Paper text:
The α, β-tubulin heterodimer reversibly assembles into protofilaments of microtubules. Crystals of the α, β-tubulin heterodimer (T2), the stathmin-like protein RB3 (R) and tubulin tyrosine ligase (TTL) were prepared following published procedures. This protein complex, denoted T2R-TTL, has been used in previous structural studies of tubulin-modifying agents.
We determined the structure of an apo (no ligand soaked) T2R-TTL complex crystal to 2.2-Å resolution to provide structure grown under identical conditions for comparison with the pironetin complex we obtained. The apo T2R-TTL complex is essentially identical to that previously described, briefly two α, β-tubulin dimers are arranged as head to tail (denoted α1β1–α2β2; subunits A, B, C and D, respectively) with the long α-helix of the stathmin-like peptide (subunit E) contacting both tubulin dimers. TTL (subunit F) docks onto α1-tubulin (subunit A). The structures of apo T2R-TTL complex and T2R-TTL-pironetin complex are essentially identical. The two α-tubulin subunits (A and C) clearly have GTP bound. In β2-tubulin (subunit D) of both structures, the density is better fitted with GTP than GDP. In β1-tubulin (subunit B) of both structures, the density is more consistent with GDP but not unambiguously so. Glu254 is a key catalytic residue that in the apo structure binds to water molecules that in turn binding to a Mg2+ ion of the neighbouring β1-tubulin. The Mg2+ ion is in contact with α-phosphate of GDP.
Author numbering:
A (entry chain E): 6 to 27, 44 to 74
B (entry chain F): 1 to 102, 144 to 151, 159 to 166, 180 to 247, 252 to 362, 373 to 384
C (entry chain A): 1 to 437
D (entry chain B): 2 to 275, 280 to 428
Write the structure that this text describes.
Amino acid sequence: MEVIELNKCTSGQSFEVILKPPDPSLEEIQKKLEAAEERRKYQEAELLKHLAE
Amino acid sequence: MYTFVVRDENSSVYAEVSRLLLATGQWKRLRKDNPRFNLMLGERNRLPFGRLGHEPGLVQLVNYYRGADKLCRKASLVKLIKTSPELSESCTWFPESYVIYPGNVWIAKSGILISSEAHVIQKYLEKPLLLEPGHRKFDIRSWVLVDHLYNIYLYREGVLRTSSEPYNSANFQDKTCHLTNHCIQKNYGRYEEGNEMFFEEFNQYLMDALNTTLENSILLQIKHIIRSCLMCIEPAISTKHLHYQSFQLFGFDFMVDEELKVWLIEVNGAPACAQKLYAELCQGIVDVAISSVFPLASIFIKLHHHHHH
Amino acid sequence: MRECISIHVGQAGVQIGNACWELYCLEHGIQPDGQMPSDKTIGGGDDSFNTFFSETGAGKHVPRAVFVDLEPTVIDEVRTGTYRQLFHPEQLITGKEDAANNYARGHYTIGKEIIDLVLDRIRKLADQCTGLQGFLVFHSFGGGTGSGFTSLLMERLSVDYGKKSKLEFSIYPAPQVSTAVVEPYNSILTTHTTLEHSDCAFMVDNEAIYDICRRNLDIERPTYTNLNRLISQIVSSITASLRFDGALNVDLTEFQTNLVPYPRIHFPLATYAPVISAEKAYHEQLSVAEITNACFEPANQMVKCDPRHGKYMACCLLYRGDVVPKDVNAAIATIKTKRSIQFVDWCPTGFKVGINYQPPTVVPGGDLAKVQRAVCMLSNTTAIAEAWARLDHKFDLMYAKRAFVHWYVGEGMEEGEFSEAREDMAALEKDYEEVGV
Amino acid sequence: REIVHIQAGQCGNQIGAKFWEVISDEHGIDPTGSYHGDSDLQLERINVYYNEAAGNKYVPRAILVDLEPGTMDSVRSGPFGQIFRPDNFVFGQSGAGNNWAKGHYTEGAELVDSVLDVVRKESESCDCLQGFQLTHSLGGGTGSGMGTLLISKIREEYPDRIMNTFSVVPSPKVSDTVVEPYNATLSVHQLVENTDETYCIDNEALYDICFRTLKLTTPTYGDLNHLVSATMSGVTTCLRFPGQLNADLRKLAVNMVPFPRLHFFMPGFAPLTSQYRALTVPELTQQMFDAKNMMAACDPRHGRYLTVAAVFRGRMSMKEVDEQMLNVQNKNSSYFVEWIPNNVKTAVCDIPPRGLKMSATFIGNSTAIQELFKRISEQFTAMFRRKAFLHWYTGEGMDEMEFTEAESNMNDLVSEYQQYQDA
Ligand SMILES: Nc1nc2c(ncn2[C@@H]2O[C@H](COP(=O)(O)OP(=O)(O)OP(=O)(O)O)[C@@H](O)[C@H]2O)c(=O)[nH]1
Ligand SMILES: Nc1ncnc2c1ncn2[C@@H]1O[C@H](COP(=O)(O)OP(=O)(O)CP(=O)(O)O)[C@@H](O)[C@H]1O
Ligand SMILES: Nc1nc2c(ncn2[C@@H]2O[C@H](COP(=O)(O)OP(=O)(O)O)[C@@H](O)[C@H]2O)c(=O)[nH]1
Ligand SMILES: [Ca+2]
Ligand SMILES: [Ca+2]
Ligand SMILES: [Cl-]
Ligand SMILES: [Mg+2]
Ligand SMILES: [Mg+2]
């Protein structure tokens, strides 16, 4: 059981014990968000057309 | 009402457990995908153990131990025996066996080949105990139930699945005398009904022919083997302190050689039962595995040993 | 010294944030007014605690934190509560109307209108950093803001700070305290959209915390306050290496290096011991061996699952209190001979161990007893995929009928996003299977 | 945050007034609009239903509408009648003669604009309006016809706000005219398209409760309205007091409505009253799920629950509440659809209603609600196949085709509820 990289300081210690070896761009984000907003606008206009009928 | 779901339609054992529970009055069967069950009688393949024990207000129980497959496949069993120090490469009750990927008689299996030349390759037991009359091979099936507390219960009735052909050293091509499976035999039925001899008869035979008992000559060794196998995998499969609990029925198959030494052949994780013993064993499953967890409003020998050293 | 900015999103993220900063103040000797008498460098410094706190010329120690919610009532409690003087008003951001438990309403409809303001406020914190390492992001999977706004933010943070690490603390939904039927939807949609933007994510299943509070703290019906005080201890254990002197997990990058060799498989399991009730009048104190052994018990995990039936890719043990390496190594030797600890073939079988000598601090009048030693284990185990399976199944049941889908479509999301998200989760479950089985 | 309340017609204004009486007492608001309560929980979400005027006066955000003055003169003389804003009383003189067409197309249309002016003035000063609740009946002319006209006009001007109704469904057992089924079928058609959530308050059920359970041999409108007001108090508790679950109208919709048209809820209440014995948590729970406690005359065992909200009020063990809610789901699992997991949500509020230590309110989205629509549909057809009483409607300019379309749409709603029950 090998103990490696022992480091000690006043607040503690660390070490390792081995038992065995072996994106979208700003533009794209903006397009997606405006497309969603366009779909909401479209649904809203369809509702108001139906209500005008 | 307690509630249960059935997810393997082909289990003979669990169709009868299901039918018993319903006739109690105090169990309701639910559609197979309703998650609000106390008890899963699970499928054999890819049972969703990760979805169990996440139901507020239901104590949940399943009829399989996750990880028990290690004991119940041929390649897995060989590896577990060789590599577990409690069993070891020098284990006396398992035949010398080798995992193989794609008196010198060996058997190849995982659809079986017996020869002295050249999956698991296993030393074929050349000197079996042979029943008289008929000079014939058999294997012993023992049924074992492990409950949620990891008690190990040996059903007191086993069965000998016999050959009805004389045993033949100089023909391993012809398999009806070398392989004791129920299907492979179906002179069938001649000596006993369905090539099944039960313990009362076999014990009588061991007394009359060999001046000993079934308990002394064979069953001590059977109990030792079952206990050693199951205690070995316990840390890996126990559901003690887990958020769901498991039980499971196992079918251990044994060979007895002519010096009355018992060898392990097989552990079956989804066994069937001999016709004659369904009713009793399935009632035992309800009493020991289910009502113990889900109480309503002994046919087993409990295997336990604490030798001090 | 290199700074870390904490971002708390939605109710869960905000309330957990409150509990964490309260605890950090107690650990570092910072008072509710922000004064820290032990800090002898007035108005600046590059001490380890400065990773999380900046300093004004008047001696105020100010969390490097932004709180964001789409309705105001939770953040108003921070504005009026005990630690109100700790935070500048511009760090606390609220809208007027929430995401109504709808990912699409957090991500698209409302997120589009507050996102520039939130990035502006984050930028203000970043401009005060001389070597910003990155971000810690706290949120629920289940809420509309915690799911939908967080995924939008994470995307934008990759664009605006592309070199920087992003870690998450994520609350996985449990029906015993959940407030919406559609939480499985929101969880899959956020996990899908966030997966490439997060380097390391610590999932906390509310069911596990809930049960620990009932079983070990004797709380009959845990509230968020009970759950969050426990969660804040686990968070503190994880971040202690960034805030105190030490040689392990000292920067955000090291979390990924030590815990995530496969980038999509970036969900370490946290297990914490011991959790002991403050009302328990006779407590026998637990040894290094006992607390370490408790790390391999499912009942102490932050997600209930069974690591015996998966494989380890990494394990870190983070100790606090009276612990020396010799006892750690003897405890580990015992555990190896008793337990099913199987690593994948391409990683060494091993533990990275950090010890901080100060015992855990507790919040006075809290539920947790003060103990002489504690440990947090962080293990990257394939068994955590059991949680993905449970969530994915629930998603499938509802989605096969399109139940509630119209609420998401009415916010301008396309139905296709559902099955794209679900297929990314199917590939994730598959990755975990290929590594683990 | 703010809800705008509208009450239309005789029924709407009678149940509406009782609602304001009951909730003003729960929030400690007296008839002058002064707060004289004992607890900060009473005032913390007071703005949801009340505006604050000068002198720390609380004024209901309430608009009172009718085509005749009679019931609104009675509102103004009622116990809380002085609390309403005077400008929020909008009344015509004509009446609507139990005629949906008069409410919707002729008499109501003449008045609807002045109602919208008041809606807009209340809406304009809302910090963040969540939406609208309307109280009305479906069997008369003003609440039914003019109420659904209002809903349509309100949607056109506030299309992104939530619309909620308490809608009283007619019954021959408590019946004013033969034309009720016509007026209700025409109204349901509107509700299916233009509300997000509708509490089906069935006069059949209220009557059966008063008669069978409460032993009132001759139930009045007052006895029926006692049940309605307790239910309304119960189902709005989560909107009115601090809490986690269903705390606004949109979150309730998202939890309760899996498909947009299936938004008709079966309310229930326990214990049933018109008494000193303490009610246990197990007993509240069994009784709140009991057919006999439901305010829509539908057998919930004849269908399945898509979603349920349960609200418990009073000092009680939350552990025991959780256990019992789990117990009813586990023992009756087949009545909850398996393809919406965890579809029952529970809230507990510490403040009980007046005169009870403990109570429970039930809100069910059950496919059994189809029974209510089928009953109305059969009464509609029995007349409509002979065109009986139609001249009341064709005299206001309506064609038969409009009756055929409304009937067809309500038969479609029934088939949809049946589809999810078999799934
Ligand atoms: N552990 C914990 N979980 C919480 C807390 N608050 C909410 N949750 C959980 O988070 C989920 C609900 O999400 P919230 O964070 O409340 O929602 P939100 O992000 O505010 O989103 P909207 O309110 O929909 O805008 C559920 O699974 C809750 O159980 C908390 O303080 N602690
Ligand atoms: N090493 C060995 N020596 C002698 N006989 C052997 C043997 N291995 C297997 N056999 C014989 O072959 C028969 C069937 O072999 P095996 O146990 O592999 O099949 P199986 O998997 O069908 C048993 P089960 O149906 O109970 O699972 C055994 O009953 C036994 O008689
Ligand atoms: N529950 C209840 N139902 C009422 C009340 N008043 C009338 N109704 C019912 O309402 C319907 C008649 O409508 P009403 O509201 O009188 O007509 P409107 O003024 O034109 O809307 C019938 O179905 C009556 O049974 C009441 O106070 N309570
Ligand atoms: Ca300093
Ligand atoms: Ca006129
Ligand atoms: Cl950068
Ligand atoms: Mg919120
Ligand atoms: Mg009338």
